Amino acid sequence: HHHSQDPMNALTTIDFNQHVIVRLPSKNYKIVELKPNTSVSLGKFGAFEVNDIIGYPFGLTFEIYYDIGKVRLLKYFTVEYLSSSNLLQFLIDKGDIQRVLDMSQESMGMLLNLANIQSEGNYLCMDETGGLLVYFLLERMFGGDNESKSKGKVIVIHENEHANLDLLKFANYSEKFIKEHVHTISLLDFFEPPTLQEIQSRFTPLPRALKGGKKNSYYRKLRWYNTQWQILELTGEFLYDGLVMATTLHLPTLVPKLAEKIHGSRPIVCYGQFKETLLELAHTLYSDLRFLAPSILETRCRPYQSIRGKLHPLMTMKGGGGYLMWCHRVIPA
Amino acid sequence: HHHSQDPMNALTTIDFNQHVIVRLPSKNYKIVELKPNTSVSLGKFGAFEVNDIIGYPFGLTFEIYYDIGKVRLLKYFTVEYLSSSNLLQFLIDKGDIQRVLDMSQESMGMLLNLANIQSEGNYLCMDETGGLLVYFLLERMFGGDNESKSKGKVIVIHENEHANLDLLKFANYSEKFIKEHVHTISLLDFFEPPTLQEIQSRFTPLPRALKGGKKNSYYRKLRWYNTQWQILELTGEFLYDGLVMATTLHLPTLVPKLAEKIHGSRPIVCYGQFKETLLELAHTLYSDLRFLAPSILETRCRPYQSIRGKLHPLMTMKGGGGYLMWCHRVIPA
Amino acid sequence: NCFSGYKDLIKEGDLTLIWVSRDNIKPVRMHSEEVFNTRYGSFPHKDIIGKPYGSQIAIRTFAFVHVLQPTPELWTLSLPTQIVYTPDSSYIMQRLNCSPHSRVIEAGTGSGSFSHAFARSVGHLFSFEFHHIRYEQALEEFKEHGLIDDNVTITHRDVCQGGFLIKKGDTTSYEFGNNETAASLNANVVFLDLPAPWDAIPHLDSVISVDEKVGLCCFSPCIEQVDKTLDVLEKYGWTDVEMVEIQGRQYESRRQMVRSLNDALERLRDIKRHIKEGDSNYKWKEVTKMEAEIKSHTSYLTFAFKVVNRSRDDEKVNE
Amino acid sequence: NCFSGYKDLIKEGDLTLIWVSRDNIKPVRMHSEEVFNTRYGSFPHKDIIGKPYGSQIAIRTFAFVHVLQPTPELWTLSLPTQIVYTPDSSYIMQRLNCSPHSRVIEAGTGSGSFSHAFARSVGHLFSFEFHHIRYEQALEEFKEHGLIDDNVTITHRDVCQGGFLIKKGDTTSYEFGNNETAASLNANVVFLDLPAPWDAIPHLDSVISVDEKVGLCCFSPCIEQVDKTLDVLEKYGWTDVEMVEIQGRQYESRRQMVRSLNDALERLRDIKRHIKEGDSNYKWKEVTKMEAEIKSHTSYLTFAFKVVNRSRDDEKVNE
């Protein structure tokens, strides 16, 4: 803002203070924060100055060479946008596959379309991964644009007092963006919300001219009050445009309760690492007329060694990738 | 035997009175019995005289042409040996996939090797398919040779009063061969066999010179007696060299009872159409120290359109193929 | 776009998807005087209009349908070759990171299956159709669905011979702005579903974004086609090239009867002395059952990326 | 052949496979003075010899092993490239209808994995090894296992340059009968695992059976190799040509904890006022879990068949 020149686009361009992906020659990923006037170490592959890569587009490979080395366009490294795909891959490389419930890129990609995820939708979500699912949703809805004019929201229902959304610290989202597009509510506040009466007995607002400590003790209470009021708005007769879930809670006695707040004709997608889990859910939903034709889906990707003359699928790879339970909320006659 | 010339080899050569496979231009199979001086109809693809194809090797394609047509080496048809593979494929073409419990060629091929099936082994078997599994076993052990000197046996344990082995009528096995290599025993006779005392009270043999009706009423009773004696030999302290199963009976409370008659270090292979079934069994066997490391295996075949210039996997095919539960009988310390 | 957003109530004139069964989904435009017929009965529209989307509709001699708002996934299942199904398309979109930031080139339009999935999330879609009659049909459909008035452009073009430029005078739905004589495609996402994608790739340099990573996916049924594609991609400077296949499966939730040894024994003891799935008179085990027929191959997916201006503004960084 | 038949009791001098864990199976020859060491303890052989095959053997400071009779499947799992695993090999054997009727040509011998599976069921096995040092090792192993004295022949040979004929004077285990100067291979089953199988296929006409359907499988990692194979097969008169791939998966039987909504609620109510798998203090759901790493590609399998004498004895049929 203090520059006369137009800002750099961090969606297209390597920019200061962005969290960014770096692919090493060994093909594993690192996440790197681009603090001005600092250096970054890649162990055996050398170190480089952050300033020397700013302003380039993503997808380029830089060589580190020595007369902390210098960088030129091509040991070496490749700099990529921190996409939902790349974040998942980083977590897998890091060894956290069980923390992401064994999910794959194709399974999450399918979940996004089965769930009909759109910029203007309000989606009900459970995410036990630390926010990876939330991030897949947000990146598809807004593309990482903190200035999006779209009004869509992800409402995260969670098991503990607070939601675990720690992965969003890598997302390059402003606090404003997050507050506008992500709402969190515990399972207890969602299924047994406080009444307006119960809320008011703790605080009712004043009819602005406050100052000092009085202004600050008041707005903290008013903050609590607005939180409570948000819960009222989200738990009333409010109806959501879809339900997406990656939780290890017991689905057969959880999903029917969540689906009462979903509008008719909206998709429901439950991700699960184990098909037997979804099988039990599908049978439970078969006998509930509020659910249309629950289906268990599986998608698996097999890459090829893609060099001309020696074309063949990869000979080994990791198993897993999980399964999707897809169905639609409907209204019985 | 009344020919001075050496007989034709029905393993290598199209021969009279053999059941044989015919592949039509539409690629579906028919089973054809080659009765001398008869004709065979293939509907829209014409009819031909059995005599005109005898003596050729298997694997040839014949054209039917007209001046009941004549045949020459190439509408058309291909004549193949009735192998265990081809019998399965015929049943699938015929639409009987559920009668064969959805099994595939690769799953049965794997079962044969996991079970270490050998010419001299005595194998315990359950087969609800009408004898397809029994036939896979017999063909691997003896190769269709009714004069094999090998001594191996398949002992079929079955649910009803008699075993359903009706598919063996297509097998081109003599009654002698079958009687020498296949024994049947009901579940009740296997788990609660009659005693020697109970058998003798109904019949004890005479010390040969009988004749007429006396010789014939005696040998019928002696036949019953020998059947009972065979059961005694197979249910005592007799131990088998392997257990192979394709049944839809409840496996967790059946397999431990069957495995008591299996020698230490012998494989156990249970085929199942549904993995959830085998999963339950594997957990049951985990806590029984008589079973070593039960594993659920899956094998799937994907053919390619194999024409040069347009190479790619088949675009559609049937799902299924089933699963194998593999483990070894062991002796706890 | 009647595929986009979230309608509450079914209105006269609305395009709906009426779910009859899993393999039977029909697109039906509501009209108060019309009737929807299935092999199970007749459903007058006036008994549907005014009810919420997702309503189960019942008639006696009871038969049912469910009336749904169109979505790309359900639309694709309703269609009767040139079809990209959801396992392939959702993967392609995820791997190329589709979002409102995306500007995509699609050729050819084919069934329009992929076009509807793109349109839902992309900033803009530029679709190209070779066949003049398929072009006209796709145009009329995209217009009726509301795609053309939102974020979709379709153009009649042999992209292998004539490239991707959109100029005034061309057969196209494109609405030219003030002082615009040509569209600036500025594509950062390219999907090619063509007989010979390697003839089209050379034309991409004129229409792709030049200051960002551009992603490309080529959709080809045969390995020989993949081989020719890998070759041209290398020649025209595309990197991070990788071919993959996607395999999708669907399972039914079913039950197998529990049949014990003891009951088989008891039946044999009796001999010695002388059904609908889920039936509560029996015990059942839950099992998953694979779809009868599987799509064991749709196409090989070849992904590639390009950056044209492999440079930075050195002095603008200095400031 | 110590892989064949069914031994009751473990004997001094027996080759055994000692199962330590799923990924740890070791071949061990029993000797009364020797000891078997694992990372869990020491197992003296004299405490094993004389016990039945399949015995669990226990020691305190309790640790266990299981002592098994060798089989081709367990042997293959015990081995440390050129390995054909059971999903591929069992399929190949089934599709080519292997039985005592089979006479097979295998080239190359590779790890000997396939050789042991063949030997168990075939009439005779003719195996060919290119490398003189691998030949000698395979020969010594096949001899020790008892294969050479049963139904297996191994020959040192570059089959692509010198073909498959076995003549007196050749480097081979083959035992020539009376008046035999050359083996009559008379092969009806051929398996080729070679860098360039298309150089070997032309030599097959001299050694395959001429009056029966001969089956061939070529094992090649790359699609380009498949393409060259399809070409030569056609030129040398092989028909019913089909390439397939086999995919094997293995699953663990596991359990996931059942965690109810109600218990999550009760935990949140408490907040408001202010573990080994299978643990019987909890509820569990049985689940299958895929092996951590999968063999997503071993090789393409190209099958083909030939009949040389495409004729019958017309007059012998007349009689």
| DSSP assignments along D167-208, one per residue | BTTSSB-----TT-SB----BSEEEE-SS-GGGTGGGGGGTB
Is D72-267+282-319 in CATH node 3.40.50.150? yes
Q: Could you state, in order of their start, the residue ranges of all structural domains in chain D?
A: 1-71, 72-267+282-319
Q: List chains adjacent to chain D, taking adjacency as at least 3 C-beta pairs closer than 8 Å.
A: A, B
Chain C residues whose CB is inside 8 A of the A252 CB are none
Mutation pick from A265, A287, A327 vs chain C, by most beta carbons of C within 10 Å, is: A265
Radius of gyration of chain A (CA): 23
Strand, coil or helix: C21: strand
Known binding positions of D for S-adenosyl-L-methionine: 84, 111-114, 129, 134, 158-159, 193
Q: How far apart are CA D69 and CA B224, in angstroms?
A: 38
**If you measure CA to CA, which chain C residue comes closest to A85?**
C95
**Token digits of residue C265:** 């024994």
Run of H or E residues at B40: strand B39-41
Instruction: Please give the single-letter amino acid code of residue B298.
Output: E
Run of H or E residues at C64: strand C63-68
Answer whether C124's CB lies under 8 Å from C188's CB. Answer: no
Run of H or E residues at C256: strand C239-257
Mutation pick from B13, B118, B306 vs chain D, by most beta carbons of D within 10 Å, is: B306
Partner A, chain C 234-293, Cβ-Cβ below 8 Å: 234, 239-253, 255, 286-288
Provide the 10 A C-beta neighbour count for residue A152: 20
Answer whether D75's CB lies under 8 Å from D26's CB. Answer: no
Please give the DSSP secondary-structure letter assigned to residue B331. B
Buried b (16+ CB within 10 A) or exposed e, A275-290: bbbbbbbbbbbeeeeb
Radius of gyration of chain D (CA): 26
Q: How far apart are CA C196 and CA C201, in angstroms?
A: 9
Run of H or E residues at B292: strand B291-305
Comparing CA positions, the residue from B71, B66, B80, B100 lying closest to residue B27 is: B80
Answer whether C116's CB lies under 8 Å from C125's CB. Answer: no
Chain B residues whose CB is inside 8 A of the D19 CB are 292-293
Backbone angles phi, psi at A289, to 5 degrees: -70, 0
Comparing CA positions, the residue from B270, B274, B245 lying closest to residue B325 is: B270
Provide the 10 A C-beta neighbour count for residue B205: 10
Q: How far apart are CA A155 and CA A141, in angstroms?
A: 14
Q: List chains adjacent to chain C, taking adjacency as at least 3 C-beta pairs closer than 8 Å.
A: A, B
CATH number assigned to the domain with residue range B84-193+236-329, chosen from the 4 options 3.40.50.2300, 3.40.50.150, 3.20.20.370, 1.10.3720.10: 3.40.50.150
Answer whether A297's CB lies under 8 Å from A282's CB. Answer: no
Which residue pairs from D37-43 have beta carbons closer than 8 angstroms and sit at least 24 positions apart in sequence? D38/D63, D38/D65, D40/D64, D43/D18
Strand partners, A60: A79
Provide the 10 A C-beta neighbour count for residue B176: 10
Strand, coil or helix: B167: helix
Q: How far apart are CA C243 and CA A30, in angstroms?
A: 24
**If you measure CA to CA, which chain B residue comes closest to D305?**
B59
Q: How far apart are CA D4 and CA C318, in angstroms?
A: 78
Provide the 10 A C-beta neighbour count for residue B95: 8
* Strand duo A243-246 + A122-127: pairing: parallel
Q: Is C313 annotated as a binding residue?
A: no
Strand partners, B245: B126, B270
Burial class (CB in 10 A: 0-12, 13-18, 19+), C63: middle
Evaluate the omega torsion of the peptide bond into residue A59 and state whether it is cis, within 30 degrees of 0. no
Q: Is C111 annotated as a binding residue?
A: yes
Please give the DSSP secondary-structure letter assigned to residue B251. G
Buried b (16+ CB within 10 A) or exposed e, C256-265: beebebeebb
Answer whether C110's CB lies under 8 Å from C82's CB. Answer: yes
Chain A contacts to B (CB-CB under 8 A): 276, 279
Strand, coil or helix: B172: coil
Chain D residues whose CB is inside 8 A of the A307 CB are none
Answer whether D219's CB lies under 8 Å from D192's CB. Answer: yes
**Token digits of residue A267:** 């998709």
What is the DSSP track for A36-100?
TT-EEE-GGG-EEEGGGGTTPBTTEEEEEE----EEEE--EEEEE---HHHHHHHHHHHT-TTTT
Q: How far apart are CA C155 and CA B191, in angstroms?
A: 76
Answer whether A23's CB lies under 8 Å from A29's CB. Answer: yes
Chain B residues whose CB is inside 8 A of the A279 CB are 276
Strand, coil or helix: C243: strand
Answer whether A69's CB lies under 8 Å from A48's CB. Answer: yes
Q: How far apart are CA D232 and CA D243, in angstroms?
A: 14
Instruction: Please give the single-letter amino acid code of residue A330.
Output: V
Strand partners, D125: D104, D152
**Token digits of residue C130:** 């070779």
A69 to chain B, minimum CA–CA distance in Å?
A: 48
Pinpoint the alpha helices (H) of chain C.
72-78, 86-95, 113-121, 132-145, 159-162, 223-235, 261-273, 314-318
Answer whether D287's CB lies under 8 Å from A277's CB. Answer: yes
In chain A, the largest separation of any two C-alpha atoms, in whole Å, equals: 78
Answer whether C304's CB lies under 8 Å from A59's CB. Answer: no
Q: How far is CA B292 from CA B264, D39, D47, D53, D222, in A?
A: 10, 20, 20, 13, 37
Using the structure block, give the residue that is written with the tokens 């090619």: C192
Mutation pick from A312, A315, A318, A323 vs chain D, by most beta carbons of D within 10 Å, is: A312
Answer whether A115's CB lies under 8 Å from A126's CB. Answer: no
Q: How far apart are CA B265 and CA D255, in angstroms?
A: 28
Instruction: Please give the single-letter amino acid code of residue A306.
Output: S
D314 to chain A, minimum CA–CA distance in Å?
A: 49
Answer whether C118's CB lies under 8 Å from C99's CB. Answer: no
Backbone angles phi, psi at C296, to 5 degrees: -75, -10
C253 to chain B, minimum CA–CA distance in Å?
A: 11
Please report how many Cα atoms fall inside a 13 Å half-sphere around the Cα of residue B220, on the Cβ side. 6
Q: How far apart are CA D82 and CA D89, in angstroms?
A: 12
Domain spanning A90-193+236-329, CATH class:
alpha beta
**Token digits of residue A309:** 């003359």
How many contacts (CB atoms, under 8 Å) link A and C?
228
Q: How far apart are CA C152 and CA C106, in angstroms?
A: 11
What is the DSSP track for C113-148?
HHHHHHHHH-SEEEEEESSHHHHHHHHHHHHHHT-T
Q: List chains adjacent to chain A, taking adjacency as at least 3 C-beta pairs closer than 8 Å.
A: B, C, D
Chain D residues whose CB is inside 8 A of the B282 CB are 253
Q: How far is CA C170 from CA C115, C180, C183, C185, C232, in A?
A: 21, 13, 11, 14, 28
Using the structure block, give the residue that is written with the tokens 């064949």: D4
Q: 3-state DSSP helix/strand/coil percent for chain A, to nearest 5?
A: 30, 25, 40
Q: How far apart are CA D275 and CA D314, in angstroms?
A: 78
Residue B6 makes CB contacts below 8 A (sequence gap 6+) with none
Answer whether A46's CB lies under 8 Å from A75's CB. Answer: yes
Q: How far is CA C2 from CA C15, C69, C72, C75, D35, in A?
A: 7, 8, 11, 12, 77
Q: How far apart are CA C10 and CA C32, in angstroms?
A: 11
Q: Is C270 annotated as a binding residue?
A: no
Answer whether D89's CB lies under 8 Å from D301's CB. Answer: no
Answer whether D61's CB lies under 8 Å from D4's CB. Answer: no
Q: Could you state, in order of their start, the residue ranges of all structural domains in chain A?
A: 19-80, 90-193+236-329
Q: How far apart are CA D92 and CA D217, in angstroms?
A: 7
Interchain CB distance below 8 Å, B316 and C285: no
**Token digits of residue B65:** 């042409």
Partner B, chain D 81-120, Cβ-Cβ below 8 Å: 86-87, 89-91, 93-95, 97-102, 117, 120
Q: How far apart are CA A54 and CA A304, in angstroms?
A: 33
Chain centroid, CA D77 distance in Å: 9
Q: How far apart are CA D148 and CA D140, in angstroms?
A: 9
Q: How far apart are CA C192 and CA D163, in angstroms?
A: 48
What is the DSSP track for chain D?
-TTSS---B--TT-EEEEEEETTEEEEEE--TT-EEEETTEEEEGGGTTTSBTTBEEEE---EEEEEE---HHHHHHH-------HHHHHHHHHHTT-STT-EEEEE--TTSHHHHHHHHH-SEEEEEESSHHHHHHHHHHHHHHT-TTTTEEEEE--HHHH-S--BTTSSB-----TT-SB----BSEEEE-SS-GGGTGGGGGGTB-SSS-EEEEEEESSHHHHHHHHHHHHHTT-EEEEEEEEEEEEEEEEEEE---HHHHHHHHHHHHH---TT-TTS-EEEEEEE-SEE---S-EEEEEEE-S-----HHHHH-
Using the structure block, give the residue that is written with the tokens 């979505």: C71
**If you measure CA to CA, which chain C residue comes closest to B98?**
C292
**Token digits of residue D286:** 């049985």
Mutation pick from A72, A238, A287, A306 vs chain C, by most beta carbons of C within 10 Å, is: A306
Interchain CB distance below 8 Å, D292 and A318: yes
* Strand duo A291-305 + A312-313: pairing: antiparallel
Of B191, B249, B275, the CB nearest to C259: B249
Interchain CB distance below 8 Å, B333 and D316: no
Interchain CB distance below 8 Å, B319 and C294: yes
Provide the 10 A C-beta neighbour count for residue C22: 13
Answer whether D178's CB lies under 8 Å from D203's CB. Answer: no
A195 to chain D, minimum CA–CA distance in Å?
A: 15
Q: How far is CA D284 from CA B230, B250, D254, D281, D316, in A?
A: 46, 21, 10, 10, 71
Strand partners, A271: A324
Q: Give the method used.
A: X-ray
Run of H or E residues at C37: strand C35-38
Comparing CA positions, the residue from C65, C58, C171, C71 lying closest to residue C120 is: C71
Q: How far apart are CA D55 and CA D90, in angstroms?
A: 28
Return the sign of the alpha-carbon dihedral for residues A139, A140, A141, A144.
Answer: positive
B238 to chain C, minimum CA–CA distance in Å?
A: 22
Backbone angles phi, psi at A135, to 5 degrees: -70, -40
Please report how many Cα atoms fall inside a 13 Å half-sphere around the Cα of residue D120, on the Cβ side. 29
Run of H or E residues at B212: helix B212-235
* Strand duo A317-318 + A153-158: pairing: unpaired
CATH number assigned to the domain with residue range C1-71, chosen from the 4 options 3.30.70.120, 3.10.330.20, 3.30.420.40, 3.40.50.1820: 3.10.330.20
What is the DSSP track for A261-330?
GB-TT-EEEEEES-HHHHHHHHHHHHT-TTEEEEEEEEEEEEEEE--TTS-EE-S-EE--B-EEEEEEE-
Q: How far apart are CA C76 and CA C86, in angstroms?
A: 8
Radius of gyration of chain B (CA): 23
Burial class (CB in 10 A: 0-12, 13-18, 19+), D36: buried
Interchain CB distance below 8 Å, D6 and B13: no
Q: How many residues in total does chain C contain? A: 319
Q: How far apart are CA A331 and CA B19, in angstroms?
A: 59
Answer whether C280's CB lies under 8 Å from C221's CB. Answer: no
Residue A25 makes CB contacts below 8 A (sequence gap 6+) with A45, A75, A76, A77
Answer whether A109's CB lies under 8 Å from C95's CB. Answer: yes
What is the DSSP track for C188-203?
SEEEE-SS-GGGTGGG
What is the DSSP track for B118-158?
-TT-EEEEEE-SSSHHHHHHHHHHHTT-TT-----EEEEEE
Chain centroid, CA A63 distance in Å: 32
Of A159, A191, A316, the CB nearest to D293: A316
The CA dihedral of A182, A186, A191, A194, to the nearest 10 degrees, is -90
Q: List chains adjacent to chain B, taking adjacency as at least 3 C-beta pairs closer than 8 Å.
A: A, C, D
Q: How far apart are CA A49 and CA A42, in angstroms?
A: 11
Chain D residues whose CB is inside 8 A of the B294 CB are 253
Q: How far apart are CA B292 and CA B290, in angstroms?
A: 7
C260 to chain B, minimum CA–CA distance in Å?
A: 5
Comparing CA positions, the residue from D6, D168, D191 lying closest to residue D82 is: D191
Q: How far apart are CA C215 and CA C187, in angstroms?
A: 9
Q: Is C315 annotated as a binding residue?
A: no
Chain A residues whose CB is inside 8 A of the C6 CB are 120-121, 241, 263, 266
